Amino acid sequence: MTRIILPGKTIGIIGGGQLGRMMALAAKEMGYKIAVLDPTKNSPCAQVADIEIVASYDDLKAIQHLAEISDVVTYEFENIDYRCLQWLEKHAYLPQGSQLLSKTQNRFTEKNAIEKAGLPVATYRLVQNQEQLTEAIAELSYPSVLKTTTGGYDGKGQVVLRSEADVDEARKLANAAECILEKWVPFEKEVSVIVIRSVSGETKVFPVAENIHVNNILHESIVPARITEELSQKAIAYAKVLADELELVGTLAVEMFATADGEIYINELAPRPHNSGHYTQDACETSQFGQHIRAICNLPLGETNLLKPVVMVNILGEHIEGVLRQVNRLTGCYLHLYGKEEAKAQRKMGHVNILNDNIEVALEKAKSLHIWDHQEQLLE
Amino acid sequence: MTRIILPGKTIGIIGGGQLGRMMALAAKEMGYKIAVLDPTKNSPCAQVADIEIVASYDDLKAIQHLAEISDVVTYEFENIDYRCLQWLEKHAYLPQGSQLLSKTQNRFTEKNAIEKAGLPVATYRLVQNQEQLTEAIAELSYPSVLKTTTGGYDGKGQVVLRSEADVDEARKLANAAECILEKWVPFEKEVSVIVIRSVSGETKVFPVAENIHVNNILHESIVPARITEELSQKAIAYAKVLADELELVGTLAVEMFATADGEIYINELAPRPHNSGHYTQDACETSQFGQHIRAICNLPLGETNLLKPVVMVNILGEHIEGVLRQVNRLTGCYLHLYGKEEAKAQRKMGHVNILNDNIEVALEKAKSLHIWDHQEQLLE
Numbered sequence: 014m015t016r017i018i019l020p021g022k023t024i025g026i027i028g029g030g031q032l033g034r035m036m037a038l039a040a041k042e043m044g045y046k047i048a049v050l051d052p053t054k055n056s057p058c059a060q061v062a063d064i065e066i067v068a069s070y071d072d073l074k075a076i077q078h079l080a081e082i083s084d085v086v087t088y089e090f091e092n093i094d095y096r097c098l099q100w101l102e103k104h105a106y107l108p109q110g111s112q113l114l115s116k117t118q119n120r121f122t123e124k125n126a127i128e129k130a131g132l133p134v135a136t137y138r139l140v141q142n143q144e145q146l147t148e149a150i151a152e153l154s155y156p157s158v159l160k161t162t163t164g165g166y167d168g169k170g171q172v173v174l175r176s177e178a179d180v181d182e183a184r185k186l187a188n189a190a191e192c193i194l195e196k197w198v199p200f201e202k203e204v205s206v207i208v209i210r211s212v213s214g215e216t217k218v219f220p221v222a223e224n225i226h227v228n229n230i231l232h233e234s235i236v237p238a239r240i241t242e243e244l245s246q247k248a249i250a251y252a253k254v255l256a257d258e259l260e261l262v263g264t265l266a267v268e269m270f271a272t273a274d275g276e277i278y279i280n281e282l283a284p285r286p287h288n289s290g291h292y293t294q295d296a297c298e299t300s301q302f303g304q305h306i307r308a309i310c311n312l313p314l315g316e317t318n319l320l321k322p323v324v325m326v327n328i329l330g331e332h333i334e335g336v337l338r339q340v341n342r343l344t345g346c347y348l349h350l351y352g353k354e355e356a357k358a359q360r361k362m363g364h365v366n367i368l369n370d371n372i373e374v375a376l377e378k379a380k381s382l383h384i385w386d387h388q389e390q391l392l393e
Numbered sequence: 394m395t396r397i398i399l400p401g402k403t404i405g406i407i408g409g410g411q412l413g414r415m416m417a418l419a420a421k422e423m424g425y426k427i428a429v430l431d432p433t434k435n436s437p438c439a440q441v442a443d444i445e446i447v448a449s450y451d452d453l454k455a456i457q458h459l460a461e462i463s464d465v466v467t468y469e470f471e472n473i474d475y476r477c478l479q480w481l482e483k484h485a486y487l488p489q490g491s492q493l494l495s496k497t498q499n500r501f502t503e504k505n506a507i508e509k510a511g512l513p514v515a516t517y518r519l520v521q522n523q524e525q526l527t528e529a530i531a532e533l534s535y536p537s538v539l540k541t542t543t544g545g546y547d548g549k550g551q552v553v554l555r556s557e558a559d560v561d562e563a564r565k566l567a568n569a570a571e572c573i574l575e576k577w578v579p580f581e582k583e584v585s586v587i588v589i590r591s592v593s594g595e596t597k598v599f600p601v602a603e604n605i606h607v608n609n610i611l612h613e614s615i616v617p618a619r620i621t622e623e624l625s626q627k628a629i630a631y632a633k634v635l636a637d638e639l640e641l642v643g644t645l646a647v648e649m650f651a652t653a654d655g656e657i658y659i660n661e662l663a664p665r666p667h668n669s670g671h672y673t674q675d676a677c678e679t680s681q682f683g684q685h686i687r688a689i690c691n692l693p694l695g696e697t698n699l700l701k702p703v704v705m706v707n708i709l710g711e712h713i714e715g716v717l718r719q720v721n722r723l724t725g726c727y728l729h730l731y732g733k734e735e736a737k738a739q740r741k742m743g744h745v746n747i748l749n750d751n752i753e754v755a756l757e758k759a760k761s762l763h764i765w766d767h768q769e770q771l772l773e
């Protein structure tokens with residue numbers, strides 16, 4: 014379409030977490046008003062929003078209320094059910110649509126969609142009962158990984174199978190939920206690419222980021238990713254094909270495995286701004302949040318050039334004390350805090366973007382701060 | 394001092410215009426809360442702030458109310474009551490102080506401060522009646538400019554005397570208000586430098602901007618300024634001298650005139666983020682607004698590296714319709730709109746940062762858009 018949502022209009026956001034907040038901040042710079050729906054009062058996004066609706070995500074009356082006061086609707090919360098999605102796409106303006114969301118919510122459906130797009134993933138099998146598990150183990154051998162098709166996050170609902178000794182735990186998981194078995198990919202680095210596509214079909218792709226997870230939570234994103242030119246260009250090419258084949262509108266985070274000998278496998282997709290793209294706030298010509306707003310409002314997209322190398326480091330509840338105490342050591346460090354009321358140990362409270370001409374110096378800065386010693390030790 | 398205002402605390406801003414709005418957005422990214430005082434409801438800053446106080450700038454009890462709900466107070470309105478600042482610095486925390494602002498509020502007092510810092514100004518005389526105007530004209534000759542000592546913005550309260558024929562208009566101005574007459578400098582370029590100094594005395598200087606005015610309102614800022622490295626170094630050294638001699642805490646904008654022989658005359662000072670510093674939002678490692686917040690909260694200052702060449706173009710009320718209509722043509726352009734509810738011909742509604750590797754291509758982009766045909770017709 015050529016449908017444009019002009020500055021001055023209201024953008025409605027389903028989900029009031031940090032992703033919503035950062036969307037709202039970028040939209041405010043451009044003169045947009047913001048409405049947000051979230052089940053808890055005073056969410057990070059509500060602190061920036063003009064209008065706040067406190068309600069469950071599955072409350073259709075409240076979704077309708079959000080839509081009826083918004084000129085365009087988007088989401089950070091992905092688990093919107095079909096009845097709400099169909100209503101939104103037909104009776105509100107939801108340029109992102111429902112089709113991509115439905116593919117990314119189920120690991121089996123997601124992998125099917127990626128292969129149909131022509132892109133490589135780990136060899137996988139659907140597991141709906143004990144016999145399918147047995148057949149899958151015999152076909153894919155060891156090592157392999159069993160994951161729940163839905164609801165899985167932070168490595169939960171996941172069993173790695175290294176030998177027959179692991180089968181018992183795998184059977185327990187498969188007893189409890191629909192699963193997929195994937196062949197274990199021996200990779201060197203986990204990487205991600207944020208890709209943007211506007212309503213009118215303009216596309217932009219951000220640089221490849223190298224992602225380091227510790228205890229199933231992202232710790233650092235490094236840009237440029239420390240991978241060969243071959244791996245880099247391949248990752249970017251794959252992300253574009255995905256955007257094109259999936260008919261993306263908005264933002265798509267493509268998480269990948271990169272092997273020593275130059276292969277990329279697509280691991281999973283997120284149809285929203287993503288933690289591995291927070292680096293863009295300080296290091297790129299446009300942030301993933303500014304791009305997201307432009308894409309859904311059908312404005313011309315900004316450029317995605319990396320202006321300075323960067324290390325994004327996540328700030329969890331366990332880190333917030335150390336961050337405030339070390340505040341006067343934060344030279345070259347660009348702090349972002351989400352305004353969450355309560356710190357919980359593993360809850361994401363913010364992040365810091367460490368900019369430097371040299372990635373290793375940025376990495377050394379994170380270390381020398383001694384805030385993430387816990388994460389550092391687990392990596393050692 | 395070593396007083397630090399930590400993220401999570403409330404920053405109070407006196408003045409709800411676009412400068413406060415942009416301070417608030419940068420503060421919110423770092424997790425600060427915002428309170429604002431403005432005489433008009435729904436101001437640009439109130440649209441982002443957590444707390445809004447609607448009141449006059451002289452309403453002591455409202456200023457008192459703001460101080461009570463803030464951990465630190467800053468100003469945005471350059472024409473603030475004064476004495477109210479003397480209340481604030483003694484009974485609350487106003488790290489900027491009152492002394493610098495009071496000096497810059499009066500052109501005569503301003504000129505004295507600059508001269509006492511050892512820097513050049515246009516030769517000037519105080520004018521309080523017709524006899525003094527007559528004597529000043531005799532001494533300074535033509536061309537010269539008569540300016541009100543207080544209340545001058547957008548070229549208001551000024552009469553340029555090119556010949557004796559302009560004296561009649563100047564005489565009317567001199568009766569209306571206290572004025573200074575100064576020599577008219579035949580500069581090659583106008584430049585500005587934004588200098589930042591924190592509570593602990595850390596000092597950062599932004600790159601020199603080349604500024605183009607039309608009808609005494611800023612039209613374009615160009616960075617890097619198209620000047621010799623020698624003039625650039627001079628301008629920066631001048632800004633550091635002023636920051637130190639005026640004992641700056643916070644932001645200081647320094648407008649300068651550059652003549653063919655390579656000389657710099659200081660035109661005026663502004664103890665706040667400045668229109669000529671808006672380019673920093675998109676083109677520098679840190680924006681002037683993020684820097685200002687860091688300065689007053691006593692956090693380490695960010696780097697001021699220019700990450701890409703930029704042309705900032707002001708969007709006035711006369712331009713808003715054109716911007717919205719030509720919104721699809723804004724590739725390479727980073728739009729900021731301030732949320733002002735009422736448009737007036739010369740009122741500042743927003744700005745656009747045009748980023749490009751080549752400064753001349755950016756300048757050509759502004760022309761090709763034809764949004765500022767009026768400005769380009771008046772320039773040639």
Ligand SMILES: Nc1ncnc2c1ncn2[C@@H]1O[C@H](COP(=O)(O)OP(=O)(O)OP(=O)(O)O)[C@@H](O)[C@H]1O
Pocket residue numbers: 135158160165166167168169171195196197198199203226229230231280281
């Ligand atoms: N096929 C595979 N081969 C090798 N390692 C894998 C495979 N699948 C998953 N992993 C490992 O398990 C980790 C988590 O799995 P996954 O990518 O499904 O994320 P998740 O469990 O949804 O958690 P998150 O919330 O971080 O996305 C990955 O980062 C990767 O290191």
Ligand SMILES: Nc1ncnc2c1ncn2[C@@H]1O[C@H](COP(=O)(O)OP(=O)(O)OP(=O)(O)O)[C@@H](O)[C@H]1O
Pocket residue numbers: 028030032089090091164165166167230231283285286287288289361
């Ligand atoms: N239990 C859950 N299951 C699925 N999604 C969740 C859950 N809890 C929170 N979310 C969603 O996760 C998003 C925030 O993602 P976050 O930044 O924590 O990690 P991420 O962007 O998925 O990166 P990673 O892949 O490393 O986990 C929000 O959209 C939020 O609604």
Ligand SMILES: Nc1ncnc2c1ncn2[C@@H]1O[C@H](COP(=O)(O)OP(=O)(O)OP(=O)(O)O)[C@@H](O)[C@H]1O
Pocket residue numbers: 030090091092353357359360361
């Ligand atoms: N996409 C999602 N699918 C399922 N549940 C979700 C999703 N997003 C959020 N939730 C639920 O909402 C809760 C809070 O959301 P989220 O995890 O994004 O914020 P948080 O700041 O991490 O809070 P907490 O640390 O309490 O989980 C989660 O614990 C989860 O139960």
Ligand SMILES: Nc1ncnc2c1ncn2[C@@H]1O[C@H](COP(=O)(O)OP(=O)(O)OP(=O)(O)O)[C@@H](O)[C@H]1O
Pocket residue numbers: 515538540545546547548549575576577578579580583606609648660661
């Ligand atoms: N002495 C001078 N010689 C030559 N040109 C001058 C002189 N004084 C002012 N000008 C021109 O007029 C413009 C506006 O002057 P000045 O900065 O004093 O106005 P102002 O209204 O106080 O500015 P602001 O809108 O920034 O508050 C200058 O940028 C310059 O172009």
Ligand SMILES: [Ca+2]
Pocket residue numbers: 165166167281
């Ligand atoms: Ca996942």
Ligand SMILES: [Ca+2]
Pocket residue numbers: 166167229230
């Ligand atoms: Ca996660």
Ligand SMILES: [Ca+2]
Pocket residue numbers: 268281
């Ligand atoms: Ca993931």
Ligand SMILES: [Ca+2]
Pocket residue numbers: 545546547661
């Ligand atoms: Ca002035």
Ligand SMILES: [Ca+2]
Pocket residue numbers: 648661
């Ligand atoms: Ca001026």
